[model samples]
Target: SKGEELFTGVVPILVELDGDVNGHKFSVRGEGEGDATNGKLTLKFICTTGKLPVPWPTLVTTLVQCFSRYPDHMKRHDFFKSAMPEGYVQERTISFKDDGTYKTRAEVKFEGDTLVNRIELKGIDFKEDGNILGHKLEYNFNSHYVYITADKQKNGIKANFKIRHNVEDGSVQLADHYQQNTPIGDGPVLLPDNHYLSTQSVLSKDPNEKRDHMVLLEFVTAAGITHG
Candidate 1:
């Protein structure tokens, strides 16, 4: 008889986007799960925009660009949707293996048709801290876009964290326990368990025009169990 191997790690991801399109507020959100055994990542988003000031085709282009700006960790996943008002749905998937082989799939359906579409920092100083599990952790990295830092205390299940964004001028603080400053591109914030963390900023280049660029994320960790 041979022993059986079991999966042990799983992670769930939730992402939400809220922004303004042609002066109209629009929202899009998606949810998905991942495991160590499966190298495939998939997410489905539902977009809601009462009505756009621009044509449907124009909106599609903007949506594509907006999603492209997501963090590198998120860009690794595929996105798809069933349908939208007067709009089409598209699906993209990528399969990976330890042997360095990959397979990709892209599917699209329109109302009647279908369509498809890093920085380094020299170290000045680094800091280390203990995690809730009594493990020592060190943090050191250079991030240009919005990023998050989190730690769990041994005393409680609450998550202590910060959200920050980076820009050419300098870094900006978004959320903290002491005070809530207006979020720029790079800053840190505090969040609670099972709570959706939302950050609002402008993703467009125009300074005169302020666009509502809000992102919400839910962080979760769990053990993977299965019977052979």
Candidate 2:
């Protein structure tokens, strides 16, 4: 259940850890392996508490145990789906990467019921110094949702994908804007100018988000692009 080969690649077999952390309860329910080489094995760790669970059991020992158990894959892909059952709390991840003839994307939702505790990896690596096999993804279950529409570059060659997920309903739809010719509304479009995607809010408490009821927005700048 331990090794240096842990993070070298995805853990092929599903290694479930239903145990405890410093006498506190810790459990990992299910797991899935993506690809074979340099891929990832998504995991789940229940952030536990008591009748009056610690507001944040941000203890040294607690964190070490949770991380050490899934050392390798944890850094890249955390949760694809919940190890915990429904009606409880859970999380997953929906990653968007630009590759192949066009950019591709995957979407997942986290509503405290069944969510893929995903990390939306974003960044620009030119020297290829960072995780050459991996870049950083920002996946926040407590964060808002991002909606995108594809752009045709006026010539329609370098099209990208659009990704989304429904909060209360939990339906993830993935598509690209290679054919979206007409604009949805207003001007000020042509994709938000940024390395990461333009994000919108699901819960109002986390305001500053654009859409509240779901609308098609524009392109989100690619994160992996390098200038040099």
Candidate 3:
């Protein structure tokens, strides 16, 4: 929905795809992990151009941020195997191509109805969220899985979108066509030369927006990427 209006509603720019020999590209504009309690996150990936290309690189990272207002900080969530404490995520990644197509993968891992593992989608089982054809669009996700956490707290204070550096310090990640210029934070979305029919993240949140405490992780190559 982000690139939609920006593409035609406002300025109405032409969508340029890479002939066909290559894949599409756009910055993994933003990324996030859901709250352990909510068990879901909403990802928003904005295109820097067409809507007016801005000078920014793409981002890539699986280790997202998780947020939570624990009843008591004394209550520790030892479920984490890598990093990231507790954070609420609206979405993990949002993608778009020069072709005007949108993609989002939902293969993920969970702990018996509780989300524990990060976006490391490798070997994780996921599901597709919504679908779009022309101006018509539809999402299979429910309310709990859709509503995002407030980006601001009382009086405009930063909502504190807990972030993690599981990608490792001084590490380089080869992101998908969507997140080449980024390793984390914000970056430019690229239009590369490759073949891409459909792409997925192989992960998603449940109706209650809760993940199974245990997770079924996956190992594979992703299409678009946004790492932090």
Candidate 4:
């Protein structure tokens, strides 16, 4: 799928792309037919869909593939790849045995020379409540952080606990602050912030993530992150 349309005031626009991202096959397509007449491209897109899974036989498969390639530093959204350092300490692998849910992963990090390479950190398995269009994609679940590195100042106090995500769900809860510096203490908080209402919406720009459920996680000092 490919195209290049006009951008006239009364015309529509279409865009698409296909490539490789970190060994994962990539394909994207977007189309919009708007009523932009008076010399304006008041554009509006209707349908867009594309996703290609990387051949990760398992967590081990992904780790091995990365170990061979991405030796250089890079940033990835929605994962724990930011938790490792150039020459910090160790990368321990472990799993959980509580509650019987689908476990993701957990790890520990020791600070070193670099700034973002210090602190004790643990990765968490995600939790989902709803489903995607119909695919049972984990909806409303928090992220499973794999790579964690604290900056030495946030050790032992559970103070600087942070994680990032690339949520594509319309059911996402909103807060001006999301980098985990401070989360609204459990329950009975606000009417709009950290919550959601309906379960369906058209695909739009960001902050308005395009899913069908809400995903806000609470990180405990002892229990890690548990979703309700």
Distance from true location, Cα of 131 in model 1, Å:
31
By TM-score: ranked, best first: 1, 3, 4, 2
Report how far residue 25 has shifted in candidate 4, in Å: 2.0
Higher-ranked by TM-score: 2 or 3 = 3
Alpha carbon lDDT of each predicted model: 0.23, 0.23, 0.21, 0.21
Candidate 2 Cα errors over 4 Å, as ranges:
1-158, 167-222
* Model 3 / residue 107 / CA error / Å: 16
Error of 1 at 223 (Å): 14
Q: Candidate 2's error at 214, in angstroms? A: 7.7
Pairwise TM-score winner, candidates 1 and 2: 1
Write candidate 2's Cα lDDT for 1-228 as tens digits: 121223234332222223332233433222333221222223322322222111111110111001112223222211111111111111112222332111112122223323232211121221232111222211212222222232335311122334432222343323123212222222222232222222222211114433211111111112322343
Ten contiguous residues with the weakest lDDT in model 1? 118-127
Off-target runs (Cα >4 Å) in candidate 3 are: 1-22, 31-45, 51-65, 78-130, 133-135, 138-142, 145-228
For model 4, residues 63-118, the per-residue Cα lDDT tens digits are 10001111112211101212222211222322222201111112222123111211
Worst 10 residues of 4 by lDDT: 60-69
Report model 3's TM-score to 2 decimal places: 0.22
User: Model 3: per-residue lDDT, tens digit, 1-228?
Assistant: 121111121111111111110132322223333432322333433333233121111122232222221122211211111111121222233232222222222222233423332321111111122111121221111111111211211211011111111122332212122211111212221122221111112233334523221111112121222222
The TM-score between candidate 2 and the true structure equals: 0.18
